[PDB]
Amino acid sequence: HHSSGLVPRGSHMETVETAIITISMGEGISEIFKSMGATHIISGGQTMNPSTEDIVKVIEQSKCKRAIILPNNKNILMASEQAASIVDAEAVVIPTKSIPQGISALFQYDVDATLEENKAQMADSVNNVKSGSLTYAVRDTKIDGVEIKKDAFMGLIEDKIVSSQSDQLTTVTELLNEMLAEDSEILTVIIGQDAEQAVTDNMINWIEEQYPDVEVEVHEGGQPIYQYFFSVE
Amino acid sequence: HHSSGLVPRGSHMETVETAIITISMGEGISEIFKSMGATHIISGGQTMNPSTEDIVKVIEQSKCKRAIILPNNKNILMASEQAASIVDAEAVVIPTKSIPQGISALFQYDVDATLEENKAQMADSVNNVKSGSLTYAVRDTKIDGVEIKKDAFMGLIEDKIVSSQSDQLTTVTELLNEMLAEDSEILTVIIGQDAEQAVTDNMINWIEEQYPDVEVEVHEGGQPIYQYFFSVE
């Protein structure tokens, strides 16, 4: 859903030496991505995905010498790779396949690090960090062939539905029961606008009991739609 | 729950050259295990787990020359290893940690194979096959700290709760959504006494859509309590 007239392509065009280009799915993630180091946000989930030439134009207009591209959607990986090949800039693609995966990869971005150091750390995150999210059904919906009734909570791992229940705590603890293992070391939790403090507190207490060795790192995100983003190292 | 008087220790004492010793959790699995090659079933989930000497006695009374022990419970692994060390027989432990894992390991047992060939294949199954089950809450219950209301269906992977819902199809398809991956090759389904044919048919149709490359191998089990056992190779 967008407003009538010309739909913005993405964020304000800044001039930068190293462009950190992230695709949003049009659900209110831009603040978070900019906070984490993104320089250019491209709006995704329009009818047409961002094209090869859409990404080339962001890279060229930014006047960057180097770029890191996070498609955050498996459908946008080809356009990103094609763009990276075309441009004069030294451009690399971190092959993130979801918004939570993009968040996890941006934890590893360091503005002081070299392009190659950032590439290696962010690419490792896609392979070795488990990303997921908690949301809810604003209307009856189908994910992965599973029918979810309006108002149900939904636990997702890498955007696949794994749990759903009318009860939020039950949904999120089942989600985390699969995301966490006895050898997990760090769980990052990013709290959305609609999260309930009593759920968050009960969830943390559950983690501490069931997975007593995991470090729980909580941050405020303020995102709509997703009560939590989770990342397990 | 057992009947008054002396509670049976396990199945009929047979004399065999190679004993295949499996622990039941006292929920109606003996038929299935015997079908699959078990020679001796020890009853588990009494107050006290089977002891080292309980297992030694089964091995000694069977007059076996060789034995394979499947504890099917992490609490019984030490007794099994201690027994295997004590007996004259050449005894090996396959370190199964649940009943579904024991089932998966028994798929690999071949009465014509050597002890070492069976050991290797069955041990590989514990490491490389994903086992799980679908059940339901006969009363309000807590698994892994998660409260489940009476009548809810429950999806388990390696005995950890991952999904639960009043709707059976939703629960089992969410379970399978996590058990199956794009590169899964074979799903074995063992149908319990209480399974519903309409659920089974809808579940199979869902698998075929979402995971079109997986081979689905269905067998009748007839077990109580677990509508399905699942094994993913």
Author numbering:
A (entry chain A), B (entry chain A): 316 to 548
Paper text:
Furthermore, the X-ray structure of FakA_C shows that it consists of two subdomains that are structurally related to FakB. The FakA_C structure consists of two α/β subdomains encompassing residues 328 to 444 and 445 to 548 (numbering with respect to full length FakA). Subdomain 1 contains a four-stranded parallel β-sheet flanked by two α-helices on one side and three on the other. The two FakA_C subdomains are each related to segments of FakB1. Subdomain 1 is structurally related to the N-terminal segment of FakB1, but the FakB1 EDD domain differs in having a 35 residue α/β insert that is not present in the canonical EDD structure. Subdomain 2 of FakA_C is structurally related to the FakB1 C-terminal segment. The structural elements in FakB1 that are missing in FakA_C contribute to the FA binding tunnel that is not present in FakA_C. Analytical ultracentrifugation demonstrates that FakA_C binds FakB, and site-directed mutagenesis confirms that a positively charged wedge on FakB meshes with a negatively charged groove on FakA_C.
Fatty acid kinase (Fak) is a two-component enzyme that generates acyl-phosphate for phospholipid synthesis. Fak consists of a kinase domain protein (FakA) that phosphorylates a fatty acid enveloped by a fatty acid binding protein (FakB). We find FakA consists of three independently folded domains. The N-terminal domain (FakA_N) is the ATP binding component, the central domain (FakA_L) encodes the dimerization function along with a Cys-His-His catalytic triad, and the C-terminal domain (FakA_C) functions to bind the FakB substrate.
